Amino acid sequence: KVKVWGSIKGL
């Protein structure tokens, strides 16, 4: 399992 998390820079 490869998880992804975050927020898009500049938005």
CB of 10 to a copy of itself, least distance (A): 8
d(CA 3, CA 10): 22
d(CA 6, CA 4): 7
d(CA 5, CA 3): 7
- Tell me, by CB under 8 A, how many residues bind a copy of itself: 10
CB of 9 to a copy of itself, least distance (A): 6
Site for a copy of itself in 1-11 (CB under 8 A): 1-9, 11
Q: Which residues bind a copy of itself (CB under 8 A)?
A: 1-9, 11
